[PDB]
Amino acid sequence: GSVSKANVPKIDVSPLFGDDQAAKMRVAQQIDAASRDTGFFYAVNHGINVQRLSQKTKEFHMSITPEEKWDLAIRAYNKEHQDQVRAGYYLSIPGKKAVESFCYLNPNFTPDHPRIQAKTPTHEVNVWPDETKHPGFQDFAEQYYWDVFGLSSALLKGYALALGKEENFFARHFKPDDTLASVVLIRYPYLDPYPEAAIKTAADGTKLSFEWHEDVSLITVLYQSNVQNLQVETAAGYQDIEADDTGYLIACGSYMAHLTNNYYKAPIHRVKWVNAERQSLPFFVNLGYDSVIDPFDPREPNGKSDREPLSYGDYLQNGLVSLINKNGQT
Numbered sequence: 001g002s003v004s005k006a007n008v009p010k011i012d013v014s015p016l017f018g019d020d021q022a023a024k025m026r027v028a029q030q031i032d033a034a035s036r037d038t039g040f041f042y043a044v045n046h047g048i049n050v051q052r053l054s055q056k057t058k059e060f061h062m063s064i065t066p067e068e069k070w071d072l073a074i075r076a077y078n079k080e081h082q083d084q085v086r087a088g089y090y091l092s093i094p095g096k097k098a099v100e101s102f103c104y105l106n107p108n109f110t111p112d113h114p115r116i117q118a119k120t121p122t123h124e125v126n127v128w129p130d131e132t133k134h135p136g137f138q139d140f141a142e143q144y145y146w147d148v149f150g151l152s153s154a155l156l157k158g159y160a161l162a163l164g165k166e167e168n169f170f171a172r173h174f175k176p177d178d179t180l181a182s183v184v185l186i187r188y189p190y191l192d193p194y195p196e197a198a199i200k201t202a203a204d205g206t207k208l209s210f211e212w213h214e215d216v217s218l219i220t221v222l223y224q225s226n227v228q229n230l231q232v233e234t235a236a237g238y239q240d241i242e243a244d245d246t247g248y249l250i251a252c253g254s255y256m257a258h259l260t261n262n263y264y265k266a267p268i269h270r271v272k273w274v275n276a277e278r279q280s281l282p283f284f285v286n287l288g289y290d291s292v293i294d295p296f297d298p299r300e301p302n303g304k305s306d307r308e309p310l311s312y313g314d315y316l317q318n319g320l321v322s323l324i325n326k327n328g329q330t
């Protein structure tokens with residue numbers, strides 16, 4: 001009853017920022033190979049200062065007070081905030097729930113933005129702590145949104161080429177003026193004693209902090225500190241994903257699986273319980289509310305797929321609710 005380790009290749013993605021088309025195809029091949037195996041790879045040579053990301057996130061997590069958390073809380077924790085379904089603070093519950101997080105959306109979502117004016121679901125105006133109590137936090141967080149947006153746009157070029165498409169096949173739908181992408185700054189704390197109520201037990205006996213799921217995204221671009229915790233499901237059981245706090249862990253979400261007829265699966269994964277202070281900082285690569293990509297099937301000579309096109313806004317709204325229903329309010 002031992003646990004094997006997943007093959008998670010490290011892919012130099014730097015050619016995807018350049019104009020060497022053959023080098024980009026060689027990256028795309030590596031993305032294809034990983035996407036057809038266990039679905040995860042580490043993007044290296046990504047150009048983002050992840051040390052600064054981790055340090056600024058830690059300063060925020062470790063200095064925000066319970067008062068500030070109520071003031072930023074999403075609707076699930078504060079009935080006064082009916083407009084915050086996505087963006088805001090996700091409180092821990094001492095003795096019951098260890099995890100806590102802060103989620104923010106496209107900074108271009110302002111009261112002027114037409115989707116906010118129209119009150120379209122999944123669109124919200126970000127909430128932020130007091131600048132003098134958290135100096136430079138909002139500036140860092142907004143800058144990081146566009147830093148990882150740029151990396152994500154390059155990765156989407158790699159995925160498009162990997163599937164035999166022109167490099168903008170996905171990226172053309174990934175735009176700063178309407179992207180529903182989100183950043184979540186998750187704190188997993190060290191706790192002694194650790195609350196038993198915050199630990200789940202999987203069917204195979206493994207103690208978990210978060211149960212199996214597929215990501216609600218096109219792709220997910222994830223930075224985690226150096227504490228091993230993630231597992232990917234394979235036909236022969238769950239395998240450990242090695243940690244690497246210098247790179248980004250990349251995987252497809254269920255929207256990619258939908259449009260490729262599962263040719264690129266959304267890998268099922270879960271979070272092992274580990275009693276260690278650590279960070280989990282995902283960027284969910286979401287398209288626009290009206291974005292639609294025609295499904296295709298790489299396995300078939302003509303690429304035909306009879307799967308219906310799915311509007312991304314419908315997918316996102318339904319998917320986020322379903323993930324809460326199935327795996328709990330985070």
Ligand SMILES: CC(C)[C@@H](NC(=O)[C@H](CS)NC(=O)CCC[C@H](N)C(=O)O)C(=O)O
Binds near residue numbers: 103184271
């Ligand atoms: C690394 C992940 C597995 C992380 N969990 C997560 O990020 C989980 C599963 S992918 N994701 C979510 O709950 C979706 C949050 C969506 C966000 N509020 C939004 O409005 O866009 C963890 O560490 O728990």
Ligand SMILES: [Fe+3]
Binds near residue numbers: 215
């Ligand atoms: Fe996930």
